[PDB]
């Protein structure tokens, strides 16, 4: 028995009380960019219901090109117009540097990844940096609201960052 | 006000009942790669609790280099050893093609994106292609289980896909 097996069993119960289908476009025309961190239940954190919001998550809530791609699709094809960025306290990206992470992988595998690990030293600062990445990008321009926050993993509160 | 405003007010209530902080490493040592699709509440779909699992989401649940990066970090730094891949029915990626998407963006903005939109015609087949991407990648090699599923947006049920 794996965790996957357990989660599939959970899904049978989820399915038993499921109502659907809902429409594809987010009913609230909003996209959340968040971290993959195990301590972030994005839906409960923001009181989101099914069908309302796109949720995009990766290591460190980094505005990579994959995030730009997902946001471009979200706005242009599926009509979203708000963006929430969520970093958080005690994030894994503050605990290593890119050069160290790459060197370690190179030692084990013989090669260095071409991608940047995208670590950063300070979360508040990187929210500003991430907001700027979105502002400067010519493909994510349909939003009427772009706001960035740091989630406190000890209190559950969101604290806004000024760009 | 905006939806962001409403969602922030929702967080006040969330924060009132919060219990933390929890440890950084996923307590169930698992990573989920899923779609940003608004109809997918991944936590509830799999009966996930706070602190258990990394959840990564983009447009179309595509295994891009950002997903590879996030899995590499998840495994190497934070000890996850299982992967669940999660496509779904009525996916937005089935509704367009890459070339036409980029053509539209270029007509409107004067610029063509560097990134591939990464659309695909067949969700089940792309699960297989996604599993294959992970299996051949030299930077994500630690998992003891890698499984892919198609979430039915009409029933809430997961259907496993086999290579
Ligand atoms: Cl989520
Ligand atoms: Mg912009
Ligand atoms: Mg591999
Ligand atoms: Zn994090
Ligand atoms: Zn989708």
CB B27 within 8 A of CB A38: yes
For residue B54, give both structure tokens.
């990394």
Residue A31's closest CA among A54, A47, A50? A54
Nearest CA in chain A to B40: A50
Dig out the tokens for A22 from the structure. 């809902």
Q: Which residues pair with B148 in a beta bridge?
A: B85, B161
- Which residues have a Cβ under 8 Å from the Cβ of A108 and sit 6 or more positions away? none
Per the CB < 8 A criterion, the answer to whether A11 and B45 are in contact is: yes
Number of domains forming the structure of chain B = 1
Q: What is the CATH number of the domain that holds A139?
A: 3.40.1050.10
Nearest to A64 among B48, B52, B66 (CB): B66
**B156 contacts on A by Cβ (under 8 Å):** 11, 14-15, 18, 20
Binding residues of B for Zn(2+): 35, 37, 88, 91
Cα-to-chain-centroid distance, residue B61: 5
Distances (CA, A) of B84 to A8, A135, B67, B80, B150: 10, 33, 13, 11, 11
Q: How many residues does chain A have?
A: 163
* A125 CB-near residues (< 8 Å, 6+ apart): none
DSSP at A60? G
Cβ(A54)–Cβ(A80) below 8 Å: yes
User: What range does the domain containing B65 cover?
Assistant: 1-163
Instruction: Please indicate the experimental technique that yielded this structure.
Output: X-ray
Per residue in B144-153, is it b (16+ CB within 10 Å) or e — as a string?
A: eebbbbbbbb
Q: How far apart are CA B105 and CA B49, in angstroms?
A: 39
- CA geometry: angle A161, A32, B116, nearest 5 deg: 115
Q: Are the beta carbons of B160 and B149 closer than 8 angstroms?
A: yes
d(CA A45, CA A57): 14
The length of chain B is 163
Cα gap B100→B97, rounded to integer Å: 6
Residues A14, B64: C-beta atoms closer than 8 Å: no
Measured distance CA(B41)–CA(B29) in Å, rounded: 20
What kind and span of H or E run contains A139? none
Phi, psi of B151 (to 5 degrees): -80, 125
* Entry resolution (Å): 1.8
| Residue A12 near residue A6, CB atoms below 8 Å | no
Question: How far apart (Å, rounded) are the C-alpha atoms in residues B50 and B138?
Answer: 30
- The alpha carbon of B117 is separated from its chain's Cα centroid by a whole number of angstroms, namely 15
Tokens linked to A93: 């990206």
CA distances from A95 to A60, A98, A118, B139 (A): 11, 10, 12, 19
> Which phi and psi (to 5°) does residue B98 adopt?
-60, -50
């Amino acid at each position: 028995g794996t965790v996957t097996d357990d989660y599939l069993a959970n899904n049978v119960d989820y399915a038993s009380g499921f109502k659907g289908p809902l429409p594809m476009p987010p009913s609230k025309h909003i996209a959340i960019v968040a971290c993959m961190d195990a301590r972030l239940d994005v839906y409960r954190m923001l009181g989101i219901k099914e069908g309302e919001a796109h949720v995009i998550r990766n290591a460190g809530c980094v505005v990579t090109d994959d995030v730009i791609r997902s946001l471009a699709i979200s706005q242009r094809l599926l009509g979203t117009r708000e963006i929430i960025l969520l970093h958080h306290t005690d994030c894994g990206m503050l605990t290593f540097t890119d050069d160290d992470f790459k060197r370690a992988i190179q030692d084990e595998t013989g090669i260095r990844p071409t991608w940047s690990p995208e670590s950063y030293p300070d979360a508040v600062e990187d929210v500003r940096q991430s907001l700027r990445r979105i502002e400067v990008n010519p493909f994510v321009t349909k939003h009427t609201s772009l706001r960035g926050f740091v989630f406190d993993v000890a209190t559950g509160k969101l604290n806004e960052v000024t760009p």
